[PDB]
C-alpha cells in the first residue's frame, strides 16, 4: 500500500507480450463498430510485438487527480468607500454560489453529467494600498445559505452569525482555508439538467433550478480608515473525495453566462479549436 501509494504504482498498465506470426482464420482486426461497442485489438494482435514489462501508473489519471486541484472560481472585489460607510449594498460583497461562473475549471467537470464531492476552499485576500498606510484591515467571510438574511448593507444583524459561518482573517495571519461536506438535497451535484421550474412557459430550465446554494455576503470589519484601499479576495476551490458518473464530450465553444449551454456568440461566427487543412493528402 505504502510503497504502492508512495511510489505511486497503484493502477498499473499491463505489459506488451511477445508475438509470432499468424496465418490464421480469425481476424481480430475486423469488428463492426456499428454495434456501438469498442474494439479490443492490441499491439500483440496486429504486429509481431516483443516483450516490454511496463511501469506506468494510471494513478494521475483518476477522477481525483484530474479533479482534486484548486481553481479560481471567483474574485470578490471591494473598492472601499469612507465617504458613505454602510449605505445600501456597499463595502460588503455577496455572489452566488457557483461556477459556470468561470471556464478552465468549469470546462473540466462538465466532462461528466453528475458529480459529487466535499471541497478545499481557500480564500486569498490581497490588500491593495491606494493610501499611504493600510492599517489593520480585518475581514469577515460568510456563507448565506438560502433562505437567510443576506446583509442589506455592511452592518446588518446578520453579521452576528449566531448560527452561521463566518471566517475571520487579519492582515499577516495566513490564508483562510477550510472545508466542506457535500451540500445537496440530491445524491449528487447536477453538473447538467433537462428540467424546468414548471409548466410556465416562462419557467427556468438548466443547472440551476438546481443550485440555489447560497451566496456569500462579505464584510471588512475594521470600521472607517483614513487612507483608502481596495480588497480582492480570490476564491479557489478543490474537490476532495470525488465521484463521477456518465462522461461527456468536452466543450469546444467558448461559453458565455453560466447555468446554460448557450454558445451563439455576439455576432462573431461560432468558433472552435479545429484547424483548417489545404489538403487531406499531406499533414
Amino acid at each position: 500500500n505504502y510503497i504502492d501509494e508512495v511510489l505511486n504504482e497503484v493502477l498499473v498498465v499491463p505489459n506488451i507480450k511477445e508475438s509470432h506470426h499468424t496465418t490464421s482464420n480469425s481476424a481480430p482486426l475486423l469488428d463492426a463498430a456499428e454495434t456501438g461497442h469498442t474494439s479490443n485489438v492490441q499491439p500483440e494482435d496486429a504486429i509481431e510485438t516483443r516483450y516490454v514489462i511496463t511501469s506506468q501508473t494510471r494513478d494521475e489519471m483518476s477522477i481525483e487527480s484530474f479533479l482534486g486541484r484548486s481553481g479560481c472560481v471567483h474574485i470578490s472585489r471591494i473598492k472601499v468607500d469612507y465617504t458613505d460607510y454602510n449605505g445600501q449594498d456597499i463595502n460588503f460583497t455577496k455572489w452566488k454560489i457557483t461556477l459556470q461562473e468561470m471556464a478552465q475549471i468549469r470546462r473540466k467537470f462538465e466532462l461528466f453529467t453528475y458529480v459529487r464531492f466535499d471541497s478545499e476552499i481557500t480564500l486569498v485576500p490581497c490588500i491593495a494600498g491606494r493610501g499611504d498606510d493600510i492599517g489593520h484591515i480585518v475581514m469577515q467571510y460568510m456563507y448565506v445559505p438560502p433562505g437567510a438574511p443576506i446583509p442589506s448593507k455592511r452592518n446588518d444583524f446578520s453579521w452576528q452569525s449566531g448560527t452561521n459561518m463566518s471566517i475571520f482573517w487579519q492582515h499577516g495571519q495566513p490564508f483562510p482555508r477550510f472545508s466542506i461536506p457535500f451540500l445537496s438535497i440530491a445524491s449528487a451535484y447536477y453538473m447538467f439538467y433537462d428540467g424546468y421550474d414548471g409548466d410556465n412557459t416562462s419557467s427556468k430550465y438548466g443547472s440551476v433550478v438546481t443550485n440555489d446554494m447560497g451566496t456569500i455576503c462579505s464584510r471588512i470589519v475594521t470600521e472607517k480608515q483614513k487612507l483608502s484601499v481596495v480588497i480582492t479576495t480570490h476564491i479557489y476551490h478543490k474537490a476532495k473525495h470525488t465521484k463521477a458518473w456518465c462522461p461527456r464530450p468536452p466543450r469546444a465553444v467558448p461559453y458565455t453566462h453560466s447555468h446554460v449551454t448557450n454558445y451563439m456568440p455576439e455576432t462573431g461566427d461560432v468558433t472552435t479549436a479545429i484547424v483548417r487543412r489545404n489538403t487531406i493528402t499531406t499533414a
Binding site: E5, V10, E64, S179, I180, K240, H241
Partner: peptide, 19 residues
C-alpha cells in the same frame, strides 16, 4: 505519518485513496 484526521468531520480530510 497518516490517518490522523485531526478534524472530527469526514468532509475534512485529505484527498481520498485509490483502490
Amino acid at each position: 505519518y497518516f490517518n490522523i484526521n485531526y478534524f472530527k468531520d469526514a468532509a475534512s480530510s485529505g484527498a481520498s485513496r485509490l483502490d
